[PDB]
Ligand binder design. Structure first.
Ligand code: BEF
Ligand code: MG
Ligand code: ZN
Lengths: 353, 39, 312
């Protein structure tokens, strides 16, 4: 985007990542790197050590911190003091974090300059309108009886892998695919993501996925008519531009993280067909009732409610029974899944050898 | 051609010496994804 | 065929007919009528022996009026044989013709200039030529006669005194006879010609024989970096007509498309209404017309082989 939007010559541009570490040989240029590549001090490659020496020796003029909400971390704040620069700009859609270090930003980088409303832009057509919904999936008795006895660590997987969520997801997938919507399914839990992907025959992406494979997944999900839904994870939570993405679903969430809630919602706010008359994007949040998942769900939406977005509770999805096949529809399969999920937890002597 | 040019006559040829000669993570989707590498 | 191609063909024909024999004309006219021509096909066409064809091809190749191309051909049911093809490389032929014409004219002009000079002297015995300056230093002591050095014999005045007019007449004749070549060369210089290759010439081929043994195809070897001297050179439209039924059908289809579009952008049923009380989700005129027509008719009367293939 930097090159596309401005007239920056390619020769004056340098990318500092793990793959290529070359820097522009021109007198003045831009260095685009990451916090991992700027805050590390113990281990550095030879080329990366030369790059770090270059950065320290030269007196920079401007620093641009994308997603600055991470600068007040234990050591990421050290880069502000070590790196030399006459001007610091931070860019972030949320200026809040769980700990009290958010206030440290005042003496770390300075005060906040400007903020923009969400509903104002939505009604002015600058951004899309979303019909945020919260689905209440009742846990079945077979799994709930184990929920009561199981400890805190196991009930997390237990109430995330309930069959009702699978069945609702299948019905919604079929309905929205008939409606021709591009669907993203987020899931922090890698095991749950893999189970859903293998059950539904759809791809999954998480930390182990390589860059080439994930790019292929994205390209095909974008331009291939056959594919309309994908199962992303925490990797694609923020700082990714998906003009085609329109529908967002959450089956597994990273606890009460309010910032991640908004960052995940941000993926579908730039839908390509976000200006056609009568369009309304969809954001589903599946939660099990009578569980601490409701506690965390109500705790992770207090920022969206403050902005102005309102979640609609969906007790039932009409026409769910008419779908031909539903995952985990039989009590026999329910029992088998119950047991499975519970069981989840001298050069001449060289020839000798 | 060089002699023809030296004598002031346009040569309709050139010296041939000047002719420059000139761990995939998910696999249940294998065989499904077309390579939309460019747009 | 381009007009420049016609001009160059005429120039080649004139040069061959004027400065070569008859068999040369036959061979080059055959190779001009056809594209690259195999040796066997040329022999069959002209009904001449190999020994007779030899001198003609050799002289034309030396004068660069004909180019050669040797390649290995593999018949499906016979031993492969290296076949020789003959064609015309127009740039090289034109350059050779131009250079030869210039050289001939220059030779005659230089001969005229030399003849305009004094005669000289000759020795009848040793048959040695002596210029005027060289003879002036060999005269006898009596200053009466020029004496040879080896023979010590009187010298005899050389010939060519009277040819002064003959050489000029020869030049005058030659220019008039060679006039056409100059005009053709002027037009050729005005235009630009592309160098010919075996493959390029094959594009204009007229088959010599029904079942010529030579395979007139150019199949270069794959990844052959070998270079030989002088072997390189520089939609569908569909129209649809509409009728009244098609018009009504088209408007109906457009209405259906609009309905589908509005449905696509419409909000879901669950989002439309608040679904709290629902159970939780989980597992005759024809005769009239006839009589009308009959009555109006009455009124009017009252008033009055398997392989790969690609679909394309
Ligand atoms: F806030 Be963006 F999606 F980088
Ligand atoms: Mg960004
Ligand atoms: Zn003599």
């Amino acid at each position: 985007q930097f090159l596309q939007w401005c007239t920056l010559q390619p020769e004056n541009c340098a990318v500092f990542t793990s793959d290529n570490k070359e820097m522009f040989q021109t007198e003045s240029g831009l260095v685009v790197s990451t916090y991992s590549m700027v805050a590390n001090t113990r281990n550095r490659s030879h080329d990366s050590q030369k790059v770090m020496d270059f950065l320290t020796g030269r007196e920079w003029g401007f620093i641009i911190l994308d997603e600055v909400h991470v600068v007040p971390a234990a050591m990421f704040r050290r880069v502000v003091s070590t790196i030399a620069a006459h001007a610091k700009l931070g860019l972030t859609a949320t200026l809040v974090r769980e700990d009290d270090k958010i206030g440290d930003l005042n003496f770390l980088i300075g005060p906040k300059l400007y903020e923009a409303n969400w509903m104002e832009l939505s009604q002015k057509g600058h951004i899309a309108n979303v019909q945020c919904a919260e689905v209440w999936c009742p846990m079945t008795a077979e799994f709930y009886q184990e929920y009561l006895r199981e400890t805190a660590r196991k009930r997390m997987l237990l109430y995330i892998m309930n069959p009702t969520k699978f069945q609702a997801c299948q019905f919604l997938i079929q309905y929205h695919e008939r409606r021709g919507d591009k669907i993203i399914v987020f899931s922090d839990n890698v095991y749950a993501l893999q189970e859903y992907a293998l059950k539904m025959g759809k791809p999954f992406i998480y930390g182990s996925t390589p860059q080439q494979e994930r790019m292929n997944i994205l390209q095909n999900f974008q331009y291939n008519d056959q594919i309309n839904t994908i199962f992303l994870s925490k990797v694609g939570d923020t700082s990714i531009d998906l003009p085609e993405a329109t529908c967002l679903i959450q089956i597994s969430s990273h606890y009460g993280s309010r910032r991640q809630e908004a960052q995940r919602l941000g993926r579908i706010l730039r839908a390509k067909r976000r200006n056609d008359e009568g369009f309304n994007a969809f954001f589903y949040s599946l939660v099990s009732k009578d569980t601490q998942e409701m506690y965390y769900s109500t705790k992770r939406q207090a920022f969206l409610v403050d902005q102005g977005y309102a979640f609609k509770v969906i007790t039932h999805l009409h026409g769910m029974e008419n779908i031909p096949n539903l995952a985990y529809a039989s009590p026999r399969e329910r029992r088998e899944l119950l047991q499975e999920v519970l069981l989840k937890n001298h050069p001449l002597i060289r020839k000798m050898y | 051609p060089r002699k023809l040019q030296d004598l002031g006559l346009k040569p309709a040829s050139v010296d041939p010496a000047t002719i420059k000669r000139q761990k995939i993570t998910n696999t249940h989707m294998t065989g499904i994804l077309k390579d939309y590498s460019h747009r | 065929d381009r007009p420049i191609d016609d001009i160059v063909k005429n120039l080649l024909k004139f040069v061959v007919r004027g400065f070569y024999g008859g068999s040369f004309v036959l061979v080059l006219d055959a190779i001009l009528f056809h594209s690259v021509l195999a040796e066997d096909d040329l022999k069959q066409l002209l009904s001449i022996n190999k020994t007779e064809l030899g001198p003609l091809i050799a002289r034309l190749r030396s004068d660069r009026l004909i180019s050669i191309h040797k390649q290995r051909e593999y018949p499906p049911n016979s031993k492969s044989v290296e076949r020789v093809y003959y064609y015309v490389k127009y740039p090289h032929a034109i350059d050779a013709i131009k250079w030869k014409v210039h050289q001939v004219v220059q030779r005659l002009k230089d001969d005229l200039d030399k003849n305009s000079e004094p005669n000289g002297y000759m020795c009848p015995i040793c048959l040695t030529k002596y210029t005027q300056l060289e003879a002036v230093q060999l005269l006898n002591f009596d200053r009466t006669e020029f004496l040879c050095s080896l023979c010590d014999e009187p010298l005899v005045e050389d010939d060519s005194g009277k040819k002064n007019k003959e050489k000029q007449d020869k030049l005058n004749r030659l220019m008039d006879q060679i006039q056409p070549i100059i005009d053709s060369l002027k037009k050729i210089d005005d235009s630009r010609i592309e160098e010919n290759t075996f493959e390029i010439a094959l594009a204009r081929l007229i088959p010599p024989q029904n079942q010529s043994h030579a395979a007139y195809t150019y199949n270069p070897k794959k990844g052959s970096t070998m270079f030989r001297p002088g072997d390189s050179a520089p939609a569908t439209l569909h129209i649809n007509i509409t009728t009244a039924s098609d018009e009504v059908a088209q408007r109906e289809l457009q209405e259906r498309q609009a309905e589908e579009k509005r449905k696509q952008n419409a909000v879901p049923e669950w989002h439309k209404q608040s679904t709290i009380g629902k159970t939780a989700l989980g597992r005759e005129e024809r005769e009239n017309e006839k009589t009308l027509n009959d009555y109006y008719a009455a009124l009017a009367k009252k008033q009055a082989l398997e392989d790969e293939f690609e679909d394309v």
